[PDB]
Design a protein around this ligand. Structure first.
Ligand SMILES: O=[N+]([O-])c1ccc([C@@H]2CO2)cc1
Ligand SMILES: O=[N+]([O-])c1ccc([C@@H]2CO2)cc1
Ligand SMILES: O=[N+]([O-])c1ccc([C@@H]2CO2)cc1
Ligand SMILES: O=[N+]([O-])c1ccc([C@@H]2CO2)cc1
Lengths: 252, 252, 252, 252
């Protein structure tokens, strides 16, 4: 079918787009850098199987993909934001508004724009790439963490109404997901190359390693395949067993 | 100590303010209507044991209560919003922005404004009145439900950083909480007067009744008393056993 | 690889075994009925793609499969129990002991018997088929529901220690999962053939239908394939959006 | 009213009994040591406000308290077990049976024995002291952690049926709860005396300290008072913000 992957260059974007395309889907890709023709053309050349779009806004993007490929069957809202770790009193209120806009309002706007066509034909899949941070909150990241939780619940809530139209809705919350060249949020440098970082990952995850783009991609393609729609409403914690809890003194 | 209860006329406002006052606290009350001298005066006359403030914005309010009474020891963010039940595609993106501003940004702004003083003296209590909808979402209320989830997690996330400063943070998520004359969200009419509504409540809650303002107030005062700070991070589901799940055919 | 599916004739047994086999795995199958050669041979003839075992106990089963097929790479603990619905005071304490033995001790015993070999190779996958009842408890089924919760947490706890040996552990908790000819727990008759039952499923699930053995099988095969080990520790709610929560009077 | 607190000398026993008594309740106490006359009398002398009982089994205990004090209004099932940390394959299946019998079957048996009298008069409170380990499992404690999870769910499931009879059911899950002279599970020595243990607690809890018996008691008394029955079904995590999750390299 036809799929849309947002912010393709970052977070769970490449894994999702690449595997979806390998599965036979036509994959329209969005990214902030695609505003520049040079960036869009370069992407199209490197990944000829993907279909980069210049459209930036929700309604604009959904309309563009629908016109170019007929309809949108799979929506992968791969949302990102660049937060700072700050004590609550050090954040500016605008810092939270920014987090909520990028992590909650955006996915909401995308579903709001594509839901009608999916409901009319009673078919489609909606996948939010959120975060596992709500499951094990770190101190001093209240904006990003709470916004991600809003997105997770948004997906679960949406599954309740869209199920009547045979539209599954899922949320994939990753952590320690290798992002390769993207800084969102675990790039090769330094996460796979610096001792302290490698050791940190070994300590906090059960599998003692970063998750791979391949793994995220396999999950996305599996859910979008229609092989297991009954998991609708699920929030998947793609965090390799994180968080590992510190044990008592003397214990290995 | 000195407490602040927002939107006192609605939701968990009166139960919280009244019980906190009976516990001996000086309770500064906020409400949109207090912007009008006539409304504020009428409230002060009816409730001489309460201290209504005219201030509307977070910083302005925190500053006024601090100036008049010395400091803010307890913050009860009784947040409200009037959402419409709507299919995802029928909402306007602005409807979600409105829900998040009222249910997430506001409590965040209040803590952002008061956290510094609490941290400097290493004492204080923060309580968010959220919702239990995230625990059992209804179809077609995605904006309100997801926003409330963001608030619940915000409370939990804040508990992690403020604990070092001896500041407990809690979230109380009610449902079917009798709101008396307030339309937010279970007024006496029709929830205690109309047969069908009375029957609905008896079916969906384990205790088969609406929760009382007194019960909410008791919990708020208990948490604010410093009797059980070790519950910091807790999201309390004040919903009387809701949700009750429909059983198989043949089962009463 | 080599997989083991217990209680193959019931619950998620057939879906798991059939899809695992279609995936290319050698699937050893356990069932209480296989104690009778007549039943085992009858099963073997009907399903040449499966390998029914006569062994009933954990240690004996693991040893038998290891001897016959080299080793056990995938363990699918498809646990079942036949509980009665009853008020807490009407149950016999033995009724709870029985539920716990069948739903907690059994999966524990199986992992206890196969873990050492998997750890030595630093490879293997463990899947518990539990229940979604803990997520939305019905009244009067305290034994079954709580035991299933124990099994879910057992899986999550195990993922923490086995991750170090590269062994993912998952729990799939279904509800309204079509069980075809098996009475555990949603057989064709009457769940797909009686109006009241069809209507009940339509009301309590978001997708308004029973889950299929195919869907459960696809998930089991996907997890066992090694395509997404990073989901280790996950409890999957395979309940089609259940539970759907009763809305206010007047709402459709 | 009349309350029963089990294993009073350990875990949440003393805080519960002491505060319930201070609240004016007649508190019948159970403990394995009370099997010996010398132990029961020594306890009665030290704590004259408490009523130690010699009864050990659920039925006889409920009956004895009912005969002596008229009825059982509050049941505080303070369950304990002394597990060993072990890799799954190192445990004996009997070690899990032992954990489940003490942490799941026991509370179930007590409610099974007292539920009828509470239902007949439509009044009563049931509180299980479980554990917060299910919320953040450590590696190698699969027996204890999963059993405690079963108990938490048992309480939640029970709230659904007993609510109709006006009987709230709660579960209090502590961790890092100072147990003073009792080895279950954080005695003064070494948790408040050894530097490494003191440092560990300051690291893994948000409040950076052990919880007190006083705090636990305050919660139990509050819940038993009938001041906030609408919290029925709640699982309280009395863990001071635990778990604190390790942050990235460079962050303090
Ligand atoms: O900003 N951060 O430090 C950050 C850390 C982790 C995440 C994981 C992927 O959700 C996201 C953001
Ligand atoms: O708008 N609504 O229909 C609504 C219903 C229930 C709530 C409960 C209190 O959280 C809030 C809003
Ligand atoms: O006995 N029962 O009524 C029953 C109902 C539901 C289940 C779901 C699959 O876990 C199991 C048993
Ligand atoms: O055995 N243990 O090591 C243990 C550790 C912590 C607990 C906390 C109270 O639940 C219980 C048992």
């Amino acid at each position: 079918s036809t799929a849309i992957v947002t912010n393709v260059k970052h977070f769970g974007g490449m894994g999702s787009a690449l595997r979806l395309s390998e599965a036979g889907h036509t994959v329209a890709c969005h990214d902030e850098s695609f505003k520049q023709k040079d960036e869009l053309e370069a992407f199209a050349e490197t990944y000829p199987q993907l279909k980069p779009m210049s459209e930036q806004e929700p309604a604009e993007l959904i309309e563009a993909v629908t016109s170019a490929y007929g309809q949108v069957d799979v929506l992968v809202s791969n949302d990102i934001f660049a937060p700072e770790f700050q004590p609550i009193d050090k954040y500016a209120v605008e810092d939270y508004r920014g987090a909520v806009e990028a992590l909650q309002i955006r996915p909401f706007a995308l579903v709001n724009a594509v839901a009608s066509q999916m409901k009319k034909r009673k078919s489609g899949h909606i996948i939010f790439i959120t975060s596992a941070t709500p499951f094990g909150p770190w101190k001093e990241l209240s904006t990003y963490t709470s916004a991600r939780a809003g997105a997770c619940t948004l997906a679960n809530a949406l599954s309740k109404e869209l199920g009547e139209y045979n539209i599954p809705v899922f949320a994939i919350g990753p952590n320690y997901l290798h992002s390769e060249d993207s800084p969102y949020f675990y790039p090769t440098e330094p996460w796979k190359t610096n001792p302290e970082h490698v050791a940190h990952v070994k300590k906090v995850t059960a599998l003692q390693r970063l998750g791979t783009q391949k793994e995220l991609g396999e999950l996305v393609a599996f859910l979008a395949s229609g092989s297991c729609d009954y998991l609708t409403g699920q929030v998947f914690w793609l965090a390799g067993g994180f968080p590992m809890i510190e044990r008592w003194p003397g214990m290995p």
